[PDB]
Design a protein around this ligand. Structure first.
Ligand SMILES: NC(=O)c1ccc[n+]([C@@H]2O[C@H](COP(=O)([O-])OP(=O)(O)OC[C@H]3O[C@@H](n4cnc5c(N)ncnc54)[C@H](O)[C@@H]3O)[C@@H](O)[C@H]2O)c1
Ligand SMILES: NC(=O)c1ccc[n+]([C@@H]2O[C@H](COP(=O)([O-])OP(=O)(O)OC[C@H]3O[C@@H](n4cnc5c(N)ncnc54)[C@H](O)[C@@H]3O)[C@@H](O)[C@H]2O)c1
Ligand SMILES: NC(=O)c1ccc[n+]([C@@H]2O[C@H](COP(=O)([O-])OP(=O)(O)OC[C@H]3O[C@@H](n4cnc5c(N)ncnc54)[C@H](O)[C@@H]3O)[C@@H](O)[C@H]2O)c1
Ligand SMILES: NC(=O)c1ccc[n+]([C@@H]2O[C@H](COP(=O)([O-])OP(=O)(O)OC[C@H]3O[C@@H](n4cnc5c(N)ncnc54)[C@H](O)[C@@H]3O)[C@@H](O)[C@H]2O)c1
Lengths: 250, 249, 250, 250
C-alpha cells in the first residue's frame, strides 16, 4: 500500500460510483497516490466532486475537461501544470457511441455516429497524451480501457468495437512515440462488470470463463496500480486482459 | 481464365495505372469478369474512363463516387442497380491521410486529420457495403486492402496505421452482419510494392521469406480467388500478400 | 479448371471417402493436377488404392509412408524422385492424439500421449518438408490443415490444441526457411465438417457463424487449389480460415 | 514490500546468478515471499543452494526435481506439501533444446531433438501444474516464461520457437482447467537480456524498442510479483510482454 507514494495521477472519466475510473481511483489512492480528477460536463461535476471528497487526506483538484474540445483540454493541463508541476500518469477512461448505432446492425452505422465514437473513444487518447507529455517530465504510464469487442466480434458492440480497435492501435503507436521520453502506454481490456439482455451475458461469463466469475472494478483498479508503478517499467504497448480469462476462449 | 466468367464487380479507387485498384482490375478482367469503375473527383474522371475503356469498352460503366458524399454514394449504386441490376462484389481500394500527419509523430496527429483518415479509409468500407448489399442479390464478396501497419507499428505509417486497424475491425463486424445474406467480406494485406521508400523495399528483399517485394499482380490474383466461388467458405479473413514478411519477429 | 495443369502433388492422409485429404484430392484433380497418394499403414492400402483408381486420367502412384518412421519417409520420397522426377507440392493432412487424452482435462494429459500427438500432428510437417524440398526443384507450396483450437481454447480439443499450436508455429518457421528455395508453406484452418457431442457443435456453428452454415470438404479443397496455384505465389506463412467466418467471433 | 507477505512460492529453473528465475526469486523475496527451489542436475545443486542460502528471513528448501522424471516430480511436490503444507504459486523457468537443432535450419530439426524440446520446455508446465494443484489449496498463480519467438519467427530460435508456441497454448488450456480451482496460469514474454552474435541483437533492441533499452531480470521479476499477487486476481491465460515494447513493432 505504498507503491505509488509521492506520485500524482490524473483520472479521467469518473461519472459515478460504479465507473471503472472510480475503481481505478480507489486502487491508486490505496496505493498512496495523489489524484486529480476531470469531469466531462457540468452535469457530472457534483458526482465527481462528491466521490473525490470521500478520499482521506488532501482534497483533490476536480476540473472540467471535454476531450473533444482542444482549447479546454489544453487549459485543463496548463492548470494541472500550474497547480502540481509534475504528474506521473493518466488514466484515460473515456468512451461514447450513440445508442442507435449500437442497437442496429453495424453496416447501418451512421457516418456522424462513427466519427463521434472515433473522436471521443479513440482520438481522445492521443489528444490527452499530447498534453500529458507536457507535465510527465519524469516519465510514467498512460492507461486506457478497452474491451474484447475491439479484437473480435461481440454482439451489439458494433461501432464501439471498431473504435476500440482504433484505440488499441493508438496505444501501440503512442507507445512507440513516447517511450523515448520515459512514458509507457498500456491498455486494460476489462471483462463485463455486473454493476455496469446484459444479464444473460454475465451468466455466460460466470459459466464459461476460466475463473467462473465476472470482473470487478477493483480487479481492474488493482491491475492499473501495477501498470502505473515501477513494477511495470519494462511494460509498454501492452493490452492486459482483466476478464477472468474469457479472452482465451474459442 | 474463366473463374469470374459471368460476374460483375465494382472497382473503387483507381486513380492511374499504378493504383493497386488497377492491378486488381486487370487480374479480374483476365479472369473473365465484367467491371464497373468509380472515380473520386472530376480530376480523375478522364484517367478512369480511359483506363476502363482499354479493358471493357467505350460502353463501360464509369461513375462518380466520392465516398465522403452520402448522396453521390447512394446515387452511384442506384445507377448501378438501374443499368446492370445485380453485381457480385466490390473491390474497395480507398485510403487517405494528410501528408502532414504522416510526416510528424503519431502523438502530434491533428484531430481533423485523424477523423479525415478514419472517414475516407475506414468508414467508407461500411458506407459502400451498405449500398452494395442492395445490388448483391446473389451474394458475393466485398474486398478491401490493408497493410501490416494496421496490426503492428510501422515507421511513418502513424495515422494510417490506426485507420487500417479501424478498417480491419470493420471487415470483421461487416462479415458478421452480411454473411447471412450470402455476402463475404475480406481483406488483403499487401506488402510494399515498387510500382525513404527504397530502403524499405531493400529490407523486404533481404528479410522476407520469399526474398522479393510484392507486385500488383500477386495482389490481383489473390483478389481473383477471394471474389471466386473457390473462396465461398472464407469470410472475415485477412490474407497477407507480402512475401511472408508478416511472420517475422 | 486448369489452374494446376502440368503440376503434380503428393497427398498425405487419405484414409477413406470423407477424409479431408480426399476432398482436397478431388479439388486438385478437378483443377488439372496429377496426384501421388501415401497410406499410413497396410490396413489403409486398399482404401487409398481404390479411391485413387476412381480418378480419370493416368494411373496414380500409391506409396506406403508412415511419418513416424524416417527410413520409410526417406524411401517414399526417394521413390517419388526416381519415378516422377519433380513435384510441385504436398498436402499434409495428418494428425493423431490418444482418445483417453482428448477425453480428460488437459492438465491430466499423459506425457507419452502429449509427445505422440506432437510427433505425428506437428513434427511430421517438418519431416515431410525436409524430404519434399529435395523433389520440389521448381518451388511450389506445402499445405497443412489446422483448427481454431490451435489458437484459442476449444472444448475437448485439449492435447490436439497444443499440437496444432506447434504445427502453426512450424508453418511459420518452415516458410522462413524454404522461401528462398521458392517453396511456400501455408495452412488452412478448417471449421468442423458434418461428414463428445459433435452435432451440437455443428448446430452452434450454423446458428452463430457469419455464413450460418458448417464447412464442407469441397470448400477446403478449393482453398487448397488456390494455395497450390500460382495465384498464391505471394502468399506464404499464412493460415486461411475456411470456417464460415467463425474465427472472428468473440 | 509486503505484497506477498505470508506467501510461499516454488521457483524452478535457477541455474546461476544470471538466470531469469533468480531475478524472479529476488523480486518475490523483496515482496515478502518465502521461496522453495528445485534443481535439475547435481551439477546445479551447488549453485542453487548457494543462492537460496543468501535469502534472509528463511531457511532453505532446495530439492532435486528432474521434470522429465514423473516419479521424482511427484515425490518432490509431496515433500513440499509435507514441509510447508500450502504453496501459493510456481515459477516455471525451464527450457532446453539441443545446440545442433538451434544452429541448423529449422527444417533440419531432428525428431528426437524436437520431442526433447517439447518434453522439457512445454509439457513440463503441465506436469508441474498437475502436481502443483495438489498443494495450492488456497489457489494462486502458475507462471511460465516465453519469448517473442513463440509467436513470430526469430532468427535461430527455430525448434525453441515451436516449443514456446506449444508452451503458450498450454498456458491457455491449463488456465481454462485450473481457474475453477482458484488457480491462475500466465506467461511473461521476456525480451533479450544483456547477461543472457548476441550483441547486435541487443544493439538493435536498444535502437528500435519503444523504451530504447534491453530488458533486465529485475523487470521480469517485478512483473512476476504482480502476477503472483492478489493484484492480478482477475488475470489468467495471459501473456505479458516484458520486452521494452519490442513486440508491437512490425
Ligand atoms: N463497462 C464495461 O463493461 C467496459 C468494459 C471494457 C472497457 N470499458 C471502458 O471503460 C471506460 C469507462 O467506461 P465505464 O464502463 O466505466 O462507464 P462510464 O459511463 O462510467 O465512463 C465513461 C466516461 O466517459 C466520459 N466522457 C464521455 N464523453 C466525454 C467527453 N466528450 N469528454 C470527456 N469525457 C467524456 C463520461 O463523462 C464518463 O465518465 C470506457 O473507455 C469503456 O469503453 C468498459
Ligand atoms: N501503397 C501501398 O504500399 C499499400 C500497401 C497495402 C495496402 N495499400 C492500400 O491500397 C489502397 C490503394 O492505394 P494505392 O497504393 O493503390 O494508391 P492510390 O493513391 O492510387 O489509391 C488510393 C485511392 O483512394 C481514392 N480516394 C481518395 N479519397 C477518396 C474519396 N474521397 N472518395 C473516393 N475515393 C477516394 C483515390 O481515388 C485513389 O485511387 C489503399 O487502401 C491503401 O491503403 C497500399
Ligand atoms: N476433422 C476436422 O474437423 C478438422 C478440422 C480442422 C483441421 N483438421 C485436420 O485435417 C487433417 C485431416 O484429418 P481428417 O479430419 O480429414 O481425418 P482423417 O482421419 O481422415 O485424416 C488424418 C490422417 O492421419 C493419418 N495418420 C495418422 N497417423 C499417421 C502416421 N503415423 N503416419 C502417417 N499418417 C498418419 C491417417 O492415415 C489419416 O488419414 C488433420 O490434420 C486434422 O487435424 C480437421
Ligand atoms: N534467455 C532469454 O533471453 C529468455 C527470454 C525469454 C524467455 N526465456 C525463458 O526463461 C526461462 C529461463 O531461462 P534463462 O534464460 O534464465 O536460462 P537458464 O539456463 O538460467 O534456465 C533454464 C533452466 O532449465 C532447467 N532445466 C533444464 N532441464 C531440466 C530438467 N530436465 N528438469 C528440471 N529443470 C530443467 C535448468 O536447470 C535451468 O535452470 C526459460 O524457460 C527460457 O526459455 C529466456
Amino acid at each position: 500500500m505504498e507503491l505509488l507514494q509521492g506520485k500524482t495521477f490524473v483520472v479521467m472519466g469518473v461519472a459515478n460510483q460504479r465507473s471503472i475510473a472510480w475503481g481505478i481511483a480507489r486502487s491508486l489512492h490505496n496505493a498512496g497516490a495523489k489524484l486529480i480528477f476531470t469531469y466531462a460536463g457540468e452535469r457530472l461535476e457534483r458526482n465527481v466532486r462528491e466521490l473525490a471528497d470521500t478520499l482521506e487526506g488532501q482534497e483533490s483538484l476536480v476540473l472540467p475537461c471535454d476531450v473533444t474540445n482542444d482549447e479546454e483540454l489544453t487549459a485543463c493541463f496548463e492548470t494541472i501544470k500550474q497547480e502540481v508541476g509534475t504528474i506521473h500518469g493518466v488514466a484515460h477512461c473515456i468512451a461514447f457511441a450513440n445508442r442507435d448505432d449500437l442497437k442496429g446492425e453495424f453496416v447501418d452505422t451512421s457516418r456522424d455516429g462513427f466519427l463521434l465514437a472515433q473522436n471521443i473513444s479513440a482520438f481522445s487518447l492521443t489528444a490527452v497524451a499530447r498534453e500529458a507529455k507536457k507535465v510527465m517530465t519524469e516519465g510514467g504510464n498512460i492507461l486506457t480501457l478497452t474491451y474484447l469487442g475491439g479484437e473480435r466480434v461481440v454482439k451489439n458492440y458494433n461501432v464501439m468495437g471498431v473504435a476500440k480497435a482504433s484505440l488499441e492501435a493508438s496505444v501501440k503507436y503512442l507507445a512507440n512515440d513516447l517511450g523515448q521520453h520515459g512514458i509507457r502506454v498500456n491498455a486494460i481490456s476489462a471483462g463485463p462488470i455486473r454493476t455496469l439482455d446484459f444479464n444473460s451475458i454475465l451468466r455466460e461469463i460466470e459459466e464459461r470463463a476460466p475463473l467462473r466469475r465476472t470482473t470487478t472494478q477493483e480487479e481492474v483498479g488493482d491491475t492499473a496500480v501495477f501498470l502505473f508503478s515501477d513494477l511495470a517499467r519494462g511494460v509498454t504497448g501492452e493490452n492486459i486482459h482483466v476478464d477472468s480469462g474469457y479472452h482465451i476462449l474459442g
